From Swiss-Prot, chain C:
Belongs to the PI3/PI4-kinase family. ATM subfamily. Phosphorylated. The chain holds residues 1671 to 1810 of 2644 of the full protein. Ubiquitous, with highest expression in testis. It comes from Homo sapiens (Human). This is Serine/threonine-protein kinase ATR.
Length: 1322, 139, 140
């Protein structure tokens, strides 16, 4: 099993008793190692790791912020044992728990505040018992705190009564223990006369606890509020023995001090703060936590001020609010920014710097250096690139060196480092740079001699420079040198030195030193994970250290046999993320480990490791290190080495020299002499033949028959390899239009061959399923249509067509038998689109396919066919398909009946006319039949049609036996419709659609809007496409590092004009968001003056531009940054959400441009309150339907001035542009699968392309613009710009395309022309 | 060290690496820095470098697909007005006019008269000031 | 069978075209010495610096490969790196310092550090390289 084991272990690890946790963790490490085969199968058999592995990874990554050190080290070892699964394989969506977000966002005098006080003081009372000197104050503080409020459980609902209610009545028992027991108070205080005026940093305030106490007391004196003074007096003295409630009360103490007092009391607290911030540490812990608590107080101040502003919007209130607001304003935002940068609170520094730039109008140019330093410290390459793109002045050399280090170009950086050494000779960071870059290019001997030279002229430096000597040495396998260098310096703790010590102690066979150093290194690696896991997207941010734990696990398991290995190295390397930074360290350490114990085949294994390094560095673009890896991979894999050199040259563009080298190698290693049947050698022969065939196909010399014969050769060599069949079939597909004159009557048998080979490829793999299945089905069904038309035309060739169509039908039938149902599931929507095919034999074969897929997955299939089943020809055809499915399995009879009843009752709900006006309709009263139906016990369980259970998960390339059978798509939780929540919500926004909420079998509730008078088939297909793009974004390393993602809800059309859409919670359109902020500011424009501002489309462009620039833009200042400030108050969450907004807007801007998405008005763009991420809705207007509107749409996507404002002071530069470029690059790389799916979507006969005619056949409705739309989409994917207008040019580069798009979207000359409903001004 | 030459050379280097876009970006940024519109470059080598950079910008624009013809023509005319004695300006202006002539006039010589006059005029001035493109301009 | 001799001939004649021809003709996988000869003949210096370090790792007592590495560093424009590299080679082996003095003298008169040029020249009498002669003239 091991699933039960992992589940109970997951729950045991999350136990309160730390010893139970430690035992669970030890046994979990043992289990993980013993079941490594099953766990590798779980992780690698599908494109996504089984759900249990994801839960386990989250649970461990959290158990590693646990306090006990053994527990941390243990989850770290278990994360290493589990592997470094690619973050794109794991699904961390389930854990968006609130967590850090609880309650009590703002508290001043409420007894929630007092309850926090009381429980902190109960921690104190137990902290009183420490030693009695703290008794003195703790006891009386608790006593007077009890006295101040209701201290008792009086059956009267008295405020303090329900605070005793509040207390976890263990502490509440402590409170009742001595309710009135005065513990002989001190009663004593020292009045602040002659006290050190610069308190911080002198006599009584030179330590954090004492400084906090002293300043808190001086403030105690100043507050004039009757109540607050009471309890501040209360705990005056234990703030002496307590730093923590000093921390707790300081925030409110300052609020009260500033809500009104003498102006110089104000100035006193102000000078105290400014002295704390201005002061520079080293110019120890007092600095740290003094600034941290100053930030605490200022955070509380601004939060309280916002809450106050809201209260006053809903007098003495206004005066107090203005008081604290003024004190907040007096502190300079740049002082706080540099103070935060010193504290290493980088995100807070970014928040403060941005508020400084916007609030106090400042030229960003003067402050670009500080911003680049901030972004380079946060390890945010996009911010560094954005600052580089913003700067007008010429970059300094340091600013150039920073940009290169962050962007990651190491050769340019090496040149820069040399020039820097020349300019400033005695700085050591430059020698660090040059040696790091030598080590990155693989120049190890050069690194050793370089560090030796630096030592020769300066001996001081060669203790920081020793890291690189040790790394180069243990990579050269020079153990003597490693020993010398390590003995020289014991100070360095860098990862390379720890790894050198470990490998050296393994070489000497010192077991105890090895294991001690191993524990130390594991602890050091877990240290940063414990800080990273307190976050969103934590696995990806701490992936470097998870890869280090992976490496430590492999190291230990390889070393143990030496001291006195079942780990699968290939599976463990394939799980890892496809990046250079992830796979390269692993392979380097693997080569070291192979050298440590020399088996016979290690001259071959090291070569294989070098080839893997070569292929990893090539795919990433490090052609220099790729070449060095090829050089180091000496021999014993001659064929593989030639294939790698060929791919390297191809990637460098030199397709000719690549073909030459490949043909040379194929003649050298697989000579015409002998048939290679030698297993792995046969596989390499097939891969080389396929590569040669492809090269030929791109080279313009070769004939068509030569290429065809090369492909047939490969399909004959390896007849159970998908790639051969796929490339053969798609080449036949290419040459078919030319050979046959683009007349399908002759295309018959070519089509049969192509279909057959697409199906064969599918049998052995799913890697090209999105190019294979769509194309196979398209060709077959369209040849069927053609054959029918010819049959009705009477031509003589139509009998030829009948025959060849019969043969194609037979091929498709054999495919039906051999392929697995999930493979057709991936195309089910297309299959259903074609159910009204005219040819009846083609329909019989299609019905067989559909019925197979229905029997395999009746829930998904039923949800996909509901729409057509309720549509006349469509109804009849879908009814026949269902009847056949029931005949094959009669258990589906009851399920189909129950589903039809549920669905037509949901239809009645959608179309039910709301009685007059009221935003709520009760399920119990208004419907009473849907509820009964779902409540029955006989009613079959109907899956809730969320996207997770509608979109299939295809097996991975690794999985042999999971493929083509034994593979479960739709892994994970299935929630059935258990019942309906009573309340139904009518919406005034979208044209009166109800909002029912379904109760799942799991107990959770799913809000489902029941939209009417809309055809959602287009939205359904669009969600399928977006989910495919989501897979592609997950698999890409840079996309995942940025966390690019499209938020796809579920759209299920119940009928031609109805449907239920999954409600996206915690979102509001851009227009309502902005209108609320404009109303709060008091600057707003009613429909009236907007009317007077609008002018007729006849008006000349200049009039429109003047109106837009002079009235609409001035009235609407940019405020969208305040939504982020008010919604995400914490600086960490503010930063995460601001960057999430940038990335999401970018992804969806690029994808919408590709798809021609229009009508992106205010409501059609929603922003998540919790994540900040953008969500697009109303996908009706697609493929440039906007240009058809009366006021056409001339912008590629929506980027108004308020959105650009939300993006920050850098604007579209920085994160937005870089996410746009990553998305564009990825959408160009995957042009062929995306274009297959889009072709099948644009030719969908069921999608309502043309509004039905008024006067009221075949259910099909052909799309006239299908060809136009396909050509335009593929142009946009190629980079070709429609805007020729007497210009002929080459396709734009990705950067050029993105730049042109952004400048078109933000152009005011275009925006002024847009319809006003689009709200271009907002 | 007294260098907008530096920006022109960076632009040419990037264009040689194939990065025509970042070439144009760096060049237009360095033209705006070193030759702010407020003060004209009337001086000796600075007018020379201004013309060199304006021509290079026109040529980048011509290579890029998003720019449409009117702006490119205006840039070339700018160059010829800045350096009227320079040959490359006239040559490239006339070359661009020759290129966009077939499209504007539908490949019909009748409307090509006026364009042909402008083209030959600028070819001829080109020749007056240099012989570097004689085999493209005289024929 | 005789492609090694032929390629060495063409490399001695300074015919890069003959070296390229011999490279295109070989059916067997090229040696590392042949790759170094192919790269030195048809200037890459990056392919060649990779090959030189690989050779240093395989054959660590040949001064030829250190010649190659330092000459490649000098061709890229990394002068300070070249001085430090030559100083390291001199650190662990003193015999090679006289043969590698050429590159440190060149990097020194190119960096314009006349003190280093003076030292490196004073500690040499056997080098008649163009680099050293130009350095002597600039120091005079
Ligand atoms: C528009 N004309 C035709 C049409 C109509 C509706 C749809 C549609 C609706 C949704 C969908 N909307 C939301 C959503 C929307 C707005 C707001 S709001 O705060 O602006 C406030 C003003 C309501 C908040 C949340 C959340 N989840 C969803 N699934 O998806 N498609 C598509 C086409
Ligand atoms: C060091 N990395 C590991 C490794 C080592 C070797 C290989 C390999 C072998 C060949 C090969 N090359 C040529 C060839 C080369 C260059 C030229 S040339 O005229 O351009 C001029 C540059 C001389 C002309 C012909 C002819 N026959 C061949 N067998 O190609 N790649 C692959 C990986």
């Amino acid at each position: 099993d091991l699933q039960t084991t992992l589940q109970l272990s997951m729950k045991a690890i999350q136990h309160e008793n730390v010893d139970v946790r430690i035992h669970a963790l030890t046994s979990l490490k043992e289990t993980l190692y013993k079941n490594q085969e099953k766990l590798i199968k779980y992780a690698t058999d599908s494109e996504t790791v089984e759900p249990i592995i994801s839960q386990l990874v989250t649970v461990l990554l959290k158990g590693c912020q646990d306090a006990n050190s053994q527990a941390r080290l243990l989850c770290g070892e278990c994360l290493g044992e589990l592997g470094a699964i690619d973050p794109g394989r794991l699904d961390f969506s389930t854990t968006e728990t609130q967590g850090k977000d609880f309650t009590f966002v703002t508290g001043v005098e409420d007894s929630s505040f007092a309850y926090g006080l009381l429980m902190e003081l109960t921690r104190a009372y137990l902290a009183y018992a420490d030693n009695s000197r703290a008794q003195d104050s703790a006891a009386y503080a608790i006593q007077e705190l009890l006295s101040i409020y209701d201290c008792r459980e009086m059956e009267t609902n008295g405020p303090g009564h329900q605070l005793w209610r509040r207390f976890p009545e263990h502490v509440r028992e402590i409170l009742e223990p001595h309710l009135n027991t005065r513990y002989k108070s001190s009663q004593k205080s020292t009045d602040w006369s002659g006290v050190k005026k610069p308190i911080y940093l002198s006599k009584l305030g030179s330590n954090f606890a004492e400084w906090s106490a002293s300043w808190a007391g001086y403030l105690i004196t100043k507050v004039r509020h009757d109540l607050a003074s009471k309890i501040f007096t209360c705990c005056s003295i234990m703030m002496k023995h307590d730093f923590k409630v000093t921390i707790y009360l300081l925030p409110h103490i300052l609020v009260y001090v500033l809500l009104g007092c003498n102006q110089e009391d104000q100035q006193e607290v102000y000078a105290e703060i400014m002295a704390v911030l201005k002061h520079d540490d080293q110019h120890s812990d007092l600095c740290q936590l003094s600034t941290q608590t100053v930030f605490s107080m200022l955070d509380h101040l601004t939060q309280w001020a916002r809450h106050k502003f809201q209260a006053l919007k809903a007098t003495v209130d206004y005066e107090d609010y203005q008081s604290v607001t003024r004190f907040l304003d007096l502190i300079p935002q740049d002082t706080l920014a540099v103070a935060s940068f010193r504290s290493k609170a980088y995100t807070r520094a970014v928040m403060h710097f941005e508020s400084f730039i916007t609030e106090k109008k400042q030229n960003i140019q003067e402050h670009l250096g500080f911003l680049q330093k901030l972004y380079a410290a946060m390890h945010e390459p996009d911010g560094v690139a954005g600052v580089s793109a913003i700067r007008k002045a010429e970059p300094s050399l340091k600013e150039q060196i920073l940009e290169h280090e962050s962007l990651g170009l190491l050769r340019d950086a090496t040149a820069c480092y040399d020039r820097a050494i020349q300019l400033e000779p005695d700085q050591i960071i430059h020698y660090h740079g040059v040696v790091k870059s030598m080590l990155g290019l693989g120049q190890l001997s050069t690194v050793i001699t370089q560090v030796n030279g630096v030592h020769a002229n300066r001996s001081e430096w060669t203790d920081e420079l020793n890291t690189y000597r040790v790394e180069a040495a243990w990579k050269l396998s020079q153990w003597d040198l490693v020993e010398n260098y390590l003995a020289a310096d014991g100070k360095s703790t860098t990862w390379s030195v720890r790894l050198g010590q470990l490998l050296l102690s393994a070489k000497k066979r010192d077991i105890t030193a090895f294991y001690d150093s191993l524990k130390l290194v594991r602890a050091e690696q877990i240290v940063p994970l414990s800080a990273a896991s307190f976050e969103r997207g934590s696995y990806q941010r701490g992936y470097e250290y998870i890869v280090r734990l992976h490496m430590l696990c492999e190291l230990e398991h390889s070393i143990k046999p030496l001291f006195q290995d079942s780990l699968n190295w290939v599976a463990r390397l394939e799980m890892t993320q496809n990046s250079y930074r992830a796979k390269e360290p692993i392979l380097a350490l693997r080569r070291a480990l192979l050298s440590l114990n020399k088996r016979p085949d290690y001259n071959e294994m090291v070569g294989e490791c070098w080839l893997q390094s070569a292929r990893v560095a090539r795919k990433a673009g490090h052609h220099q290190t790729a070449y060095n890896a090829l050089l180091n991979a000496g021999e014993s894999r001659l064929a593989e080495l030639y294939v790698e050199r060929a791919k390297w040259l191809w990637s460098k563009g030199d397709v000719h020299q690549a073909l030459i080298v490949l043909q040379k190698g194929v003649e050298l290693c697989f000579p015409e002499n002998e048939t290679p049947p030698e297993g792995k050698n046969m596989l390499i022969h097939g891969r080389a033949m396929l590569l040669v065939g492809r090269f030929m196909e791109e080279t313009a010399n070769f004939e068509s028959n030569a290429i065809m014969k090369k492909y047939k050769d490969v399909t004959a060599c390896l007849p159970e390899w998908e790639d051969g069949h796929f490339y053969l079939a798609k080449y036949y597909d290419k040459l078919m239009p030319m050979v046959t004159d683009n007349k399908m009557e002759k295309q018959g048998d070519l089509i049969r061959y192509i279909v057959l080979h697409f199906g064969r490829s599918l049998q052995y793999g799913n890697q090209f399923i999105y190019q294979s299945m769509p194309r196979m089905l398209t060709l077959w069904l369209d040849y069927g249509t053609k054959a029918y038309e010819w049959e009705k035309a009477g031509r003589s060739d139509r009998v030829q067509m009948r025959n060849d169509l019969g043969k194609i039908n037979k091929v498709i039938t054999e495919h039906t038998n051999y392929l697995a149902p999930y493979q057709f599931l991936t195309a089910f929507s297309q299959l259903i689109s074609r159910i009204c095919h005219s040819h009846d034999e083609v329909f019989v074969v299609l019905m067989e396919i559909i019925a197979k897929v229905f029997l395999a997955y009746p829930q998904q299939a039923m949800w996909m066919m509901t729409a057509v089943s309720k549509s006349p020809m469509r109804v009849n055809r879908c009814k026949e398909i269902l009847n056949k499915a029931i005949h094959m399995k009669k258990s589906l009879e009851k399920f189909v009946g129950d589903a039809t009843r549920l669905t037509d009752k949901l239809l009645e709900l959608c179309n039910k006319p709301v009685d007059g006006s009221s935003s709520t309709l009760s399920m119990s009263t208004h419907f009473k039949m849907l509820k009964k139906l779902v409540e029955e016990a006989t009613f079959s369980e109907i899956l809730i049609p969320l996207q997770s259970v509608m979109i299939p998960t295809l097996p991975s390339i690794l999985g042999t036996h999971a493929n083509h059978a034994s593979h479960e798509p739709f892994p994970g939780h299935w929630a059935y419709i258990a019942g309906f929540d009573d309340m139904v919500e009518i919406l005034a926004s979208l044209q009166k659609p109800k909002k029912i909420s379904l109760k799942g079998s799991d107990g959770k509730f799913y809000i489902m809007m029941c939209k009417p008078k809309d055809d959602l088939r287009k939205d359904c297909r669009l969600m399928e496409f977006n989910s495919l793009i989501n897979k592609c974004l997950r698999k890409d390393a840079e996309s995942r590092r940025r966390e690019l993602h499209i938020r796809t809800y579920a759209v299920i059309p119940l009928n031609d004009e109805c449907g239920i859409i999954e409600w996206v919670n915690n979102t509001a359109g851009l227009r309502p968001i902005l209108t609320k902020l404009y109303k709060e500011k008091g600057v707003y424009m009613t429909g009236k003056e907007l009317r007077q501002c609008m002018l007729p489309k006849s008006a000349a462009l200049s009039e429109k531009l003047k109106v837009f620039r002079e009235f609409l833009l001035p009235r609407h200042p940019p405020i969208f940054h305040e939504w982020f400030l008010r919604t995400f108050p914490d600086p960490t969450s503010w930063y995460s959400s601001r960057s999430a907004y940038c990335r999401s807007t970018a992804v969806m801007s690029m994808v919408g441009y590709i798809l021609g998405l229009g009508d992106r008005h205010g409501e059609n763009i929603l922003f998540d309150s919790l994540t900040g991420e953008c969500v697009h809705v109303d996908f009706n207007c697609l493929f440039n339907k906007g240009e058809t509107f009366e006021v056409p749409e001339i912008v590629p996507f929506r980027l108004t001035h308020n959105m650009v404002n939300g993006m920050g002071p850098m604007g579209t530069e920085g994160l937005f542009r870089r996410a746009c470029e990553v998305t564009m690059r990825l959408m160009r790389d995957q042009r062929e699968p995306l274009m297959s799916v889009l072709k099948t979507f644009l030719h969908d006969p069921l999608v309502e392309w043309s509004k039905p005619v008024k006067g009221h056949e075949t259910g099909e409705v052909v799309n006239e613009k299908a060809k136009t739309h396909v050509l335009d989409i593929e142009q946009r994917l190629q980079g070709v710009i429609k805007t020729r207008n007497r210009v002929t040019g080459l396709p734009l580069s990705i950067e050029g395309h993105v730049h042109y798009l952004i400048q078109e979207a933000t152009d005011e000359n275009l925006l002024c022309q847009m319809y006003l409903g689009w709200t271009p001004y907002m």
